[PDB]
């Protein structure tokens, strides 16, 4: 098995357009995800709110849909609650809240894409382990 383009190919938006990451982008995203995100989201879970994870089916059901590059890049800009009803930049790392979340200060726009890419590819590789928790370690 290997990191093929089929696996590196993830929805761009909810229209249904797709985008194919490079191996570079994927490993870029993984690195960045470990830098800015893994402290709470190691393995696709959320240590500080375990009820919400990064499985694709969970993101798909969020308001607005987050199972695509656009929705995720937007989330990193202006995070909302799962139902879309309140903006939570005050308590979630985001570009909008980089004054208080200093790790987000050096994230550029293509970094966001790599990160969102990592999140969408990893379930395809790891399956249930991603967002599954210790049961699957």
């Amino acid at each position: 098995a290997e990191l093929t383009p089929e696996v590196l190919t993830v929805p761009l938006n909810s229209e249904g357009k797709t985008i194919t990451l490079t191996e570079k982008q994927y490993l870029e995203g993984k690195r960045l995800f470990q830098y800015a995100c893994a402290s709470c989201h190691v393995g696709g879970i959320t240590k500080t709110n375990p009820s919400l994870d990064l499985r694709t089916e969970t993101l798909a059901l969020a308001t607005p849909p987050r199972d695509n590059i656009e929705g995720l890049v937007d989330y990193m800009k202006n995070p909302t609650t799962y139902d879309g009803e309140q903006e939570i930049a005050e308590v979630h790392p985001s570009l909008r809240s980089a004054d208080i979340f200093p790790k987000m200060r050096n994230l550029t726009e293509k970094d966001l894409v790599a990160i969102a890419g990592h999140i969408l590819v990893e379930p395809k590789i790891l399956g249930d382990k991603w967002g599954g928790g210790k049961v699957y370690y």
């Binding site: 009820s51 919400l52 969970t58 059901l61 969020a62 308001t63 609650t81 799962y82 139902d83 879309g84 009803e85 309140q86």
Partner: peptide, 14 residues
């Protein structure tokens, strides 16, 4: 309350 996450628009507010 965690079960209201399996259908969209329902969590956390409704």
């Amino acid at each position: 309350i965690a079960a209201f996450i399996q259908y969209r628009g329902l969590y956390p507010t409704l």
